[PDB]
Design a protein around this ligand. Structure first.
Ligand code: HEM
Ligand SMILES: CC[C@H](CC[C@@H](C)[C@H]1CC[C@H]2[C@@H]3CC=C4C[C@@H](O)CC[C@]4(C)[C@H]3CC[C@]12C)C(C)C
Length: 398
């Protein structure tokens, strides 16, 4: 087709450009886009290869955002204490410090409380009748859960939601008002997080803030900025990913009504349904790396300093991996999708167990309760070159 600029948010205004991805996978799977420029990596195996080699494909050298913020090097330095933008050994140490609360056994203990919240959220949405599926359901469950898990009082959860909207929504006019919105949001959140850390140091609780201030690995503890940036990461990741998998998942189930019928008849399909909802929605569309040295990928020569972009949404339609990839099949198995990153990468989603649980519980509850969910208008996409997000989705229940 054309040589679309896949770092341009407007390219995604009418949905994920899956035909361009499909053409690239078949014809130019490792493709240099000129513009200085970037390599588009669109095949499943190549995204896996890039992800599992941080020595060659660095997250630190040029950060992980896909658009050229090169001549503003102050924004790279403002984000370099983000765990996402660290290479080993720095990243290894930080990941060990923060990982304890997200092991499967730690996440498994949350299922009953998550289920209680999802049941109440769905109940209140059903009584409301007409509502926004995002604000009242898809956003509300992960927001309540992430507040309770972190240790933020439920009364303050709306501040968490507004902050993270301002931090990721820098390309959407509704979510942000000026170029310093996210920086100011970060300053406010850092002040809030430090208050919480101070309280839990004096008086520990069973929450993630207490786990973080108490954590100690190899004689190391979290510094103030390390704590602040992980607190931020948890809040934003918790509020800007799961809700989009839920929104796009509900949309796909309504757009493929036979699949929704079968989930409501057999709720034991929910685990595989979650993975197909993640493959389908690919809420995190892409992440960037930078080649630390000359190297070859898919028979293509990548130089030191070259920007390399992994497109997870393209990999999640790779015909070599998924049979009939444009079919939404909630029983698809196996389903080695890359929605959480390439398998084998050191940055593979720390919250993957929590995300799956939240999505599974929510759609179970939406299924067990069997209201007739129906769209009353077109969903409004988030303007972004990074998130595949739904801002609003008006629906009617029963
Ligand atoms: C719900 C859908 C989610 C998706 C699709 C998603 C996607 C991703 C992706 C693609 C990465 C980077 C992988 C890589 O670079 O190799 C990542 C990293 C990460 N995610 Fe998730 N995520 C989700 C939910 C969550 C949640 C709920 C949390 C925590 C509350 C979370 C916490 C993190 C953290 C801390 C990292 C950085 C790990 C590191 O750098 O070592 N994520 N996520
Ligand atoms: C939903 C995806 C999820 C998390 C990715 C987040 C944590 C990345 C995305 C956008 C970044 C911000 C951009 C601009 C600035 C301004 C700066 O002054 C302070 C740092 C800050 C807020 C950056 C803070 C970090 C942000 C939110 C998954 C994939 C981990």
């Amino acid at each position: 087709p054309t040589d679309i600029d896949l770092t341009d948010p407007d390219v995604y205004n009418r949905g994920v450009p899956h035909e361009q991805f499909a053409w690239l996978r078949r014809n130019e799977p490792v493709y240099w886009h000129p513009e200085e420029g970037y390599w588009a990596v669109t095949r499943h195996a190549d995204v896996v290869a890039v992800s599992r080699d941080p020595e060659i494909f660095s997250s630190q050298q040029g950060g992980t955002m896909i658009q050229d913020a090169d001549a503003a090097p102050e924004e790279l330095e403002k984000q370099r204490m983000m765990m996402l933008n660290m290479d080993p050994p720095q990243h290894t140490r930080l990941r060990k410090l923060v990982s304890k609360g997200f092991t499967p056994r730690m996440i498994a203990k949350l299922e009953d409380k998550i289920r209680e919240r999802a049941k109440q959220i769905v109940d209140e949405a059903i009584e409301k009748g007409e509502c926004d599926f995002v604000a009242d359901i898809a956003a509300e469950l992960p927001l309540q859960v992430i507040a309770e898990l972190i240790g933020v009082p439920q009364e303050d959860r709306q501040r968490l939601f507004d902050w993270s909207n301002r931090m990721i929504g820098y390309d959407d006019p509704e979510y942000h008002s000026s170029e310093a919105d996210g920086e100011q949001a970060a300053a406010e959140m850092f002040a809030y997080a430090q208050e919480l850390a101070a309280e839990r140091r004096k008086n520990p609780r069973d929450d993630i803030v207490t786990a973080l201030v108490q954590a100690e690995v190899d004689g190391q503890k979290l510094s103030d900025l390390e704590f602040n940036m992980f607190f931020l990461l948890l809040v934003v990741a918790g509020n800007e990913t799961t809700r989009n998998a839920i929104s796009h998942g509900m949309l796909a189930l309504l757009e493929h009504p036979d699949q929704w019928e079968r989930l409501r008849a057999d709720p034991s399909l929910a685990p595989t349904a979650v993975d197909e909802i993640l493959r389908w929605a690919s809420p995190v569309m892409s992440f960037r790396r930078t080649a630390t040295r000359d190297t070859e990928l898919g028979g293509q020569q990548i130089k030191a300093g070259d920007k390399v972009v992994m497109f997870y949404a393209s990999a999640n339609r790779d015909e070599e991996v998924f049979d009939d990839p444009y079919t939404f099949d909630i029983t698809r198995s196996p389903n080695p999708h890359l929605a959480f990153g390439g398998g084998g990468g050191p940055h593979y989603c720390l919250g993957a167990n929590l995300a799956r649980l939240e999505i599974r519980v929510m759609f179970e509850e939406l299924a067990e309760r069997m209201p007739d969910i129906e769209l009353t208008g077109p969903p409004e996409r988030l303007r972004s070159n990074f998130i595949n997000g739904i801002k609003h989705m008006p629906v009617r229940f029963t």
